[model samples]
Target: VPTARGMISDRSGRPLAVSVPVNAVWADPKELIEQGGISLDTRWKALSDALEIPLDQLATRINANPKGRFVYLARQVNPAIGDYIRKLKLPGIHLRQESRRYYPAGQVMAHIIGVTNIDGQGIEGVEKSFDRWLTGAAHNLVLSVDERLQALVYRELNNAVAFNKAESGTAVLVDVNTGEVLAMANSPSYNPNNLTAMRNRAITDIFEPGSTVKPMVVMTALQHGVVKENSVLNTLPYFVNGHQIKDVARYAELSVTGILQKSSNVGVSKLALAMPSSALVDTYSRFGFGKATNLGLVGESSGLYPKKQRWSDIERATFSFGYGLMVTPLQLARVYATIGSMGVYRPLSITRVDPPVAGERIFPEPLVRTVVHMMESVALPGGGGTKAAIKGYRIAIKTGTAKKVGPDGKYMDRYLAYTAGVAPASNPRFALVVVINDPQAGKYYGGAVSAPVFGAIMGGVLRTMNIEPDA
Candidate 1:
């Protein structure tokens, strides 16, 4: 009979999951002594080398198993290494056939594909959510991702960490049309070959999204017809409901497009205030804020978004600028995808999804075009997100820098920087979001840290995918 087989791969035919021959070794003490234990010292050295442990530790483990006839030496070992160790002709060592999960991409796609346990079971990320499908004997899963693009994202984010000496970083790329995640990469990543060395920062951490949330607020206003692309607002610094709102760029009078280009906190706050509380909460919910994407990863966080009834004056002001709310990088990527898709909200997935039904309006088409144009202007020369600009492509982006909250609930001096963008602005194709947690001293802002990474990654992705720039 053919053994059960299943594997995962990107659309471009790069394998994410596959079964590799593995062996589990157990030592039978009775058999060892029956065979005279002739090479006890050699046995110890071979076991230690195979397990990557010291001889003393291997001996201690064996001695601790006095009553048991068989001592489990190692749960899983590569076939080649196990074969080599077996050739030593040790009396007690035994080997059993097993299957193992191998990730050739390694840390580059760790948070997205996640990892399986010692038994070859999916533990988190897409693996967890679609474990049944991933393990099914009947079919294979082909994702919408391009592994080449995934590598580009990892390299750029890793470069950002090295260049800025930041604490950690994350990047996600999504298809705007169907909300399919193309590449989700995180820095300070762990090699899947050593699952025990995994870090919580890549999968479990959540932070305030800062100005990256501005586009959602703007989308809300447009959806409610409370504002238009050409609408003007006082971009001057102001205090609203006890919260001081300011723009990084001091634009005296900014059109709606200009507000985004300048990233005016006051401007967005005022625009958000123009809509009803119900509208704001509804829009946020529709965008996947405060909700888990159910990507099947363990420890996936659903970020905090306050209820409409719980809103205070300060909460409203702070929420407008992404200060009071918390979200995961995955959720943030979905928000951009929603806006990039022109207001049509779709669930994000690591697995492949079917083609979108036509005439499915998530938001008004006019509103979508308008906001995408504004996002495009932000990446143009002299716009706020120019730092995220790719020369031949039309990119729309926003940069955010938020102070990390300390245990006391007050803002810490350290900051989280982020850059979120969508590309081919005229007819949006992909959206990318990158976050760098706590950049080093003297280089802490989003524009300085995250935006450059966004540029580099998206630039490489565009080239690899042969995605033409918008005119």
Candidate 2:
């Protein structure tokens, strides 16, 4: 008897992956050996062609187990092919209904909703993440992903990667209020029908975040009473620990908000150096850096951040601008999501969580609110991330362009251009991260390459989710 496997559906109850009935061709080798008439029949050759098994191989398989009661000739054959074989009506051969996994969304959701193995067992992604419940043991899984949002994110991101001729890319969209993953799109995706290209880069790929963590530095300073939103900082080029710290321009004076608008490395380094080293490190840890998101997906990297006995001024400053550490896109999205949720550190969820799970308070609401307000400048006019701005809505985002290390263990000309942000700053609803690695279109800046993609997806997400506009 075959029990049906559970379905994997999206939040809207649309099936993303389903298990359907197929035929498995089996034979009683002992009966075939005893029945001489059918053994020598021409139908066996026809069966060989239908199954695409060489005639010699089919003969060997059937004859190899002559004394055995049963042998499988082919598994998970299509109903039409099986029907074609049934007309042959050869003795000792029979067909049985079996389960096979089918992905309706194809490459769009392939990385998140993985394909199952030949035995109908999960081997990767959500399939492997919630294998037991889906393999006829319990109920179907209702994932938090919205198919509409997923499609929009993938189409925009795939187009960007292709236009830029980038090496690889990933885009992740999270429901800020509930900490549920709404959509995770990866470029250079493969068809799940072939069960190839199984890597879910959103959680598994790690890279230095560049200036994306500047908000963490400012948040640390604000919490420590070292700086306020009105605090003025130096943006002049200077050196700390023998390494020069500079930005695109040397603005003599910048308010705390102005510093973020210009994305000044020196300004943030000054803020980071103002506090004890532990202050900045603790802020990052509290925001879920240097650890896996624990989304239950396989091959997820925990990422890397330093825990040093003695911190150099350069190292501390580097951490301020998102260097000297590594993080997955999911971890980066979680940080922005925590900010969007007003400092509640909720564990991210893949499956639908009714009523939503309560989160821990990692920072005070007032302090986190201040940080979120400052970040809003990034996507506004006169800010570095103006391309990410959506009309009729306020967006808080950070753009990053980190230098990638080459195979020789040194910084290469290659780069990872990325942007992470939360939408409708007045009343946040979604957090999105978009990363385009090694863009070869002669434009590799996050503001230029990744921010536009972020805006397009965020705009679609806001409309699709029917979120209220708050500019």
Candidate 3:
């Protein structure tokens, strides 16, 4: 007998992960078929008809151990199969109650929703994260996830992964106003479905977050009064301790706002170094960059961050442009949400908690306002994130294309393209992040690979949530 367990549902109380009573069809070969009551042929005929078990295998299985009392016909059989077998009224046949966890969301939410083991115990993802609340006495734990958004994100990610023939994909969406994770999907997912590829990657897996980290450095520059909104900076090669950094194009100078718009490695590199390294890394730590997302998810890595004692000259310059550190998709989304929150950093949540925490102040409203404003242009006609632009909505977003690290500890040619953005940027309502690993298609840049997916999902999410257009 299995203990009852709670179901996991979406924002609207729809069951996305569930458990149901199933039957294990078993046989008592010696007591039933070997009995003097019926001939073996007659018994085998009834079993074949009722269980739909082939005559040959049924006979072998039963006869091989006819002297044994117990044999299993099937476990976790469908109710239809169980019903048919029950109606047959065959001897020695028994229906034992069993439980199986089911997911209507399947691979769509498999990474985030997780699954249970054959013993009906939580095995991975949120199930393992919050096993205490869900096991023992049945208690449905309603998450802040939205099924519509989950489906949309999954569909778009699958299409993008298939189109690019990429290794895998990860996408996450959160309520800007409430830190609730709305939807999270990972491609190349597992069944149970464990495809747990995304499990804590959204919160645990860390990579050099690439240019997505640029905004934080810029925010630090602004917070410490090291740069003005219109301060012009050179985009030529910036050298630190013999290493040189440069943007794709050599612009004579780009304003601080333009740094974000063009996603200039050279521009932000110089701007990030303008402030003390402690001042810079502190900004990142305050925003939860190198810390666990605190969502209580299992295997959540706090990511990697440099200590003041270990900060190198090269690390300082490279960190400004999102190198030498790592962050999960979940942390990345939270950072975007914090920027959208006008500088407030909130603890993110997976379950339903009425009105989310009020969040703490990271930067003042003005600093975040300016940075968020700069990000909006990234999605505009001429900005780097142009592919993320949506009609009739103000989308503030950043795109990143980073060289993935190889197993040998060197930078590999493989790339991870990503986009972190928000909808109705003026008064943001939703925040989203999209990541595609090692995209192999002709296009591999973040704007081309991940930005479009961000736009599609965010646009649909905005509509699904009934958020008004402020564009």
Candidate 4:
């Protein structure tokens, strides 16, 4: 009796991963050779022809196993092929039923819907996470992922990474209210059918966020009354703890919005310096950093966020500008989603939740709203993330270019470009993060490399979901 394994599907009821019943063709060589003796030579040729194996090779295999009770001719053969072989009815030929895991969506959903081992055990992705629940009779494991959105995201990220000649790339899309990941895709992907490249970079890979966290830091500053939305500050170059913090240009002065729009390191550092040391760190905690989203994906990394009794001025400044810590793409997307939901920090779900869980109020709605509005400037005409701005959508986004550490424990010329944000800034719904790592192309900035991919995917998402435009 074939004991059926459970099925795993997307929220839309599309099958992503499945266990298909297959047949394995094996033989009792001793029984074949002894029973028929010399007469078996003609039948052996027939068997080799049916199996599409060369006669010489088939002879060698059967002859070597003449005294053996059993030997495999082929494993995991489809029903059609198995049936064809069965019709020959050569003595000792037998078929064994088995289940083989299949991924219909292939590499597009590879990182999320992982593959099973040859023994039919879950080994990675949600497969490993929910193995116990999936091992029994047929039960459908419903996920929050949207297959259409996932394919779209994968295609965009794949193209971007290939075009830029990057080592790898990852993108995550999530619903703001439910915290359901709509689509999570990684580039340099492998087809799950072949069981390769098992890492899901979105949840497992961590990196310094660089300037992407500026908007959040600014939000913390505004919440503590250290700065107002329109607060002006000197953006001149400066040093803290013997490290220089400067902007591309000597911006003599900038309002809070201007600081975010330009992604001013000096300006945001000053804001962080003016606040209590714990204020920014505590605020980061509320945004779900330093902890795993625990989305139930296997090997999900709890990103690096530090805790220290003594705080250095430089530490505060670097953290303010999105350094001195690490975050996975999924966690980074959640940060934006929390802000987009008007400060409600809900746990991200990999499974379908009919009614969203009640979220903790991490910050007041008005404060997050202000920050979201301020973030819109970054996609405006003169801003760093202009490429990510769609015509009819009011998008709030930030871009970052972080230097990657090399084997020698020093910063290398390698860089990771990041573009992250929510759409319909006036009424946020989706949060997406895109990161392109180690782009060999000349242009490596987030706005130049990663933001375009973000724009294409977000634009497609809004259109596909029929989200009304805010701009």
Highest TM-score among the candidates is held by which one? Answer: 4
Superposition error at 30 for model 3 (Å):
17
TM-score of each: 0.84, 0.86, 0.86, 0.87
Point out where model 4 deviates above 4 Å: 1-3, 24-80, 83-95
**Per-residue lDDT tens digits of candidate 4, residues 209-244?**
899989878888887788878789999988898889
Q: Kindly list the per-residue Cα lDDT of model 3 for residues 1-471, writing each as its tens digit.
A: 556678899878988877677687767778776555235546557767666667777667667677776666765677887887787677787888866577887877777777765456677888888788888865788988888888999899889989989988889887777899988788877666321154545665677889998888888887788888889987888678888887885687899878888888888777766766787788888888888777777787778877656676778888887887788888888988888888888888888778847989888998888888888889987688888888898888989999999878898888998899877888988889899999998899999899999988888888887878876
Weakest ten-residue segment in model 1 by summed lDDT: 194-203
At residue 386, give the lDDT of candidate 4: 91
Model 4: lDDT to the true structure? 0.86
Residue pairs in clash, model 4: none
Residue pairs of candidate 1 with colliding backbone atoms = 125-297, 129-296
Native-to-model Cα distance after best TM-score fit, residue 137 in candidate 2, in Å: 2.5
| Cα deviation of 237, candidate 3, in Å | 1.9
Clashes of 4: 0
State the lDDT at 41 in candidate 4: 55
lDDT of 1: 0.75
- lDDT preference between candidates 2 and 3, better one: 2
Candidate 4 weakest lDDT stretch, 10 residues: 37-46
Model 1 residue runs over 4 Å out of place are 1-5, 22-43, 46-84, 87-92, 134-138, 194-204, 222-228, 357-360
